[PDB]
Each structure stands twice: as C-alpha cells, then as structure tokens.
Write a protein that binds this DNA or RNA. Structure first.
Length: 69
RNA sequence: GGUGGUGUUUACCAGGUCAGGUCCGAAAGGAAGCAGCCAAGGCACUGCC
C-alpha cells in the first residue's frame, strides 16, 4: 500500500494537491520525505509543512492497518 | 574538447511550461509555482571535426 493507492481515496481536494506535488520515488517509499522534501512538497501544493506532516501521518494510519489485516 | 547519435540516469538549489493546489483581487483578472513534461546535466557507447 504505497501513496499511489492512498491517493485514489477544497476538503480533500487539498489532500490530493499535496501528493500531486510528490515524485514517483516519494509516493512509492515515503520513508524518504525528510525536511528538505517537505519544504518542497508543501510550497508545491500551496500548503505548509505542518499540512504535509498531517497527510503524512494520515497515510501511516491508513497504512499500518493494511500491514495488520 | 566541439558537434551529432543511442542507451541510462537526475526531488528542491536564479532553464521553459505548468495539471493539480496556493496567493492577491469585490470583480475583471493578476502572481509565484510542485509533480509531469521539455530542455539541460551526469555515466557510458558511438559518427564526424
């Protein structure tokens, strides 16, 4: 379950904008989205790092389950 | 090296365009711009000079 699937799932429209700002490598192996990338991803999706961190946290939640069922 | 070709590679770090999103604006409309793409660079093979 990579960020590519979690994408299929201005309310959420912005939660998309964020991913539509990532790169294939990022959307495929999130454990590489440190500071620098974030600062890119945020300003890229007109958001803010905190926003990204939010979505990042969301993915994890929606992720762990897959790895537990 | 120059200038071509082909394969490969490259998140941001004053190239271009810009979905999506953001920004300013009562509006009309402006602005910056991620991914993508183009271009460009790198690693090689290669033609020519």
């Amino acid at each position: 379950f990579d960020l590519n699937d979690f994408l299929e799932q201005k309310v959420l429209v912005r939660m998309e904008a964020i991913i539509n700002s990532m790169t294939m490598k990022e959307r495929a192996k999130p454990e590489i989205i440190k500071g620098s990338r974030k600062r890119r991803i945020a300003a890229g999706s007109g958001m803010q790092v905190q926003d990204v961190n939010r979505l990042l946290k969301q993915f994890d939640d929606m992720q762990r389950m897959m790895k537990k069922m």
